[PDB]
């Protein structure tokens, strides 16, 4: 793992003592080489897992998150490049350093073994995100957005820390797989119910539950494109990783202390897919899409079945890639029109006839067009919840319909009408952003061809 | 598609448009030309029977009743010419109606062909940055200071001046 972290740490000097003309190039190339080297983790020839130290470890669930994290970096580098172009060399080096720090901390917290290290890193992920969102946003509500994000997270995270201490005291360690080989059943008492609540709310907030989803749309709409991408792809996954790791000891409480969250997820799914029909901001639309998709992940972790966890992992990675792609697609226009309003610009696919394809495929994925991992996840979540109770299929179908509606709405109100001929400032498509979209898509094709790397722990 | 409605339609215009719609729906109902001519002559007789009348109140009443008769006897699937609203070709070539400014982004190796074309496009601009300032004054100076205003536009009264606000009525794409 250290062969992955040390070079990521060295990307910093490179960034600062690189000349003002080659820093972007060099750091991007080496970030790509890091993404390449990270594939050592995929050499899993046995059911035994990796353990490089007492402090690090890798699993079939942490490896894909780690590789997606190491892959998204150069894409964010490329995407944060047109803006902050006039900004000073020092400022853009600061930006690059923020990105690299996020990379390193996310890799660490995915490769961690101890819940408290996981905690300090899952809570150190705030500084760079807050700084990016507040120092490089364009509106005046980015400050309130950072407040919301930061404090939702911390209010959810404190009781988690307290529960971790309670455990570290009852048991003598917070180490994973020891917390597994020594776990006991519980007494189904109110103290342990509150322990459950504490352990869970942090992650149920970091991946937006229906009722506490009021930090994601803000952060997205007010944040730059790299912040949007990382928030949509990985910061929404820290909660899933944490719950998949902490739910092993809370048995057998989640059999009955999970109903409220299953209900909230299955309902907010509909109640956000519907907002995706009547929202005017493209970015907020995609945010509510992310919410409606993470609801499935939540409801699937809650029921604790192998198919459920498999679908959760598949959909996690797939939604990461697809949301990053959609955000970058909307950014391509924003850079040209400086307005997130969707119905303003229309009739594209005439001057941008190719980007209308990327727009289309990112939509084919979000609406779960087979063969695709979005669907290979949704289907198995649906089957697991149908075994749970057969009446979930109703809400699942409603959500499917609304998704197929608002995806094509987003397509047609931007690319499939007639042009706003009064738009003189439609600079043709950059090779850079076409490459962004291609780098987002192709890995989805490859993971659809080899979805054995994406099932997870159970499979 | 070339003018703007007036602040209010006059009784004459109302009656004329009612006549036109009534005849179009008569065509829709009667598929054969002989029948169409027969009943069109009948309808025009019905109309002319009240052309030399002047009582405005009774006229408006006859019109309010004829419009109801029309709504009650109208064909619900009338004939619409293809390229017109409701027709099977309305807004069909808007996909190929690309504007003119889309050529300012072309690449030298693209306008390298059609060189004789792009030379004209150039001097068509020279004919625009010069003909702009005087198109404003002609509007400023021809303004009604009594508040009243409508969607009309004047021509140019000189040798060399051009109609104000022409670039978009000129330069627009073919229909094809």
């Amino acid at each position: 793992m250290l062969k992955i972290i040390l070079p990521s740490l060295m990307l910093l000097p490179l960034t600062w003592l690189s000349s003002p003309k080659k820093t972007w190039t060099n750091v991007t190339s080496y970030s790509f080489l890091i993404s390449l080297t990270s594939l050592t983790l995929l050499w899993q020839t046995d059911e035994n897992y990796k353990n490089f130290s007492n402090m690090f470890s890798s699993d079939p669930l942490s490896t894909p998150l780690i590789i997606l994290t190491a892959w998204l970096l150069p894409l964010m580098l490329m995407a944060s490049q047109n803006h902050l172009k006039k900004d000073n060399n020092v400022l853009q080096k600061l930006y690059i350093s923020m990105l690299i720090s996020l990379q390193i901390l996310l890799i660490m917290t995915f490769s961690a073994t101890e819940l408290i290290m996981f905690y300090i890193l899952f809570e150190a992920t705030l500084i760079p995100t807050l700084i990016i969102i507040t120092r490089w946003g364009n509106q005046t509500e980015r400050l309130n957005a950072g407040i919301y994000f930061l404090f939702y997270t911390l209010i959810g995270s404190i009781p988690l820390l307290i529960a971790l201490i309670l455990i570290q005291n009852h048991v003598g360690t917070l180490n994973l797989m020891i917390l597994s080989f020594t776990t006991h059943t519980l007494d189904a008492s109110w103290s342990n119910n509150l322990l459950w609540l504490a352990c869970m709310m942090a992650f149920l907030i970091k991946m937006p539950l229906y009722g506490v989803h009021l930090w994601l749309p803000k952060a997205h709409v007010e944040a730059p494109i790299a912040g949007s991408m990382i928030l949509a792809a990985i910061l929404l996954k820290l909660g899933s990783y944490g719950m998949i790791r902490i739910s092993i000891i809370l048995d057998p409480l989640t059999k009955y202390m999970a109903y409220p969250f299953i209900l909230l997820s299955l309902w907010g799914m509909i109640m956000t897919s519907s907002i995706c029909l009547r929202q005017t901001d493209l970015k907020s639309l995609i945010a509510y899409s992310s919410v409606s998709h993470m609801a499935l992940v939540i409801a699937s972790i809650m029921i604790q079945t192998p198919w459920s966890f498999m679908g959760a992992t598949m959909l996690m990675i797939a939604h990461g890639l697809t949301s990053s792609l959609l955000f970058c697609l909307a950014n391509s226009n924003y850079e040209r029109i400086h307005s997130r309003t969707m119905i303003m610009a229309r009739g594209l696919q005439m001057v941008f006839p190719l980007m209308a394809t990327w727009w289309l495929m990112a939509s084919l994925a979000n609406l779960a067009l087979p063969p695709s991992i979005n669907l290979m996840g949704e289907l198995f979540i649906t089957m697991s919840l149908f075994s749970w109770s057969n009446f979930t299929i109703i809400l699942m179908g409603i959500n499917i319909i609304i998704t197929g509606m608002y995806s094509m709405y987003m397509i047609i109100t931007t690319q499939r009408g007639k042009l706003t001929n009064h738009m003189i400032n439609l600079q043709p498509s950059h090779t850079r952003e076409l490459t962004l979209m291609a780098l987002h898509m192709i890995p989805l094709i490859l993971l659809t061809t080899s979805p054995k790397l994406i099932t997870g722990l159970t499979m | 598609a070339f003018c703007a409605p007036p602040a209010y339609l006059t009784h004459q215009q109302k009656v004329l448009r009612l006549y036109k719609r009534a005849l179009r729906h008569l065509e829709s109902w009667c598929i054969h030309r002989d029948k169409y001519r027969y009943f069109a002559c009948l309808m025009r007789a019905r109309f002319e029977e009240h052309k030399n009348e002047k009582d405005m109140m009774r006229a408006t009443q006859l019109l309010r009743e004829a419009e109801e008769e029309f709504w009650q006897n109208q064909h619900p699937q009338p004939y619409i010419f293809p390229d017109s609203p409701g027709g099977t070709s309305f807004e069909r070539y808007e996909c190929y109606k690309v504007p003119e400014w889309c050529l300012d982004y072309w690449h030298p190796s693209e306008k390298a062909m059609y060189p004789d074309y792009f030379s004209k496009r150039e001097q068509w601009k020279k004919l625009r940055m010069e003909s702009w300032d005087r198109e404003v004054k002609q509007l400023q100076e021809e303004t009604s200071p009594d508040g009243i205003m409508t969607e009309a536009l004047p021509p140019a009264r000189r040798e060399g001046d051009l109609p104000p606000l022409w670039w978009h009525i000129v330069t627009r794409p073919r229909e094809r």
């Binding site: - | 889309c102 982004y105 693209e110």
Partner: peptide
């Protein structure tokens, strides 16, 4: 024969 307006497509 006439001229068909089109975007760049070179980029």
């Amino acid at each position: 024969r006439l001229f068909v307006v089109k975007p760049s497509l070179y980029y």
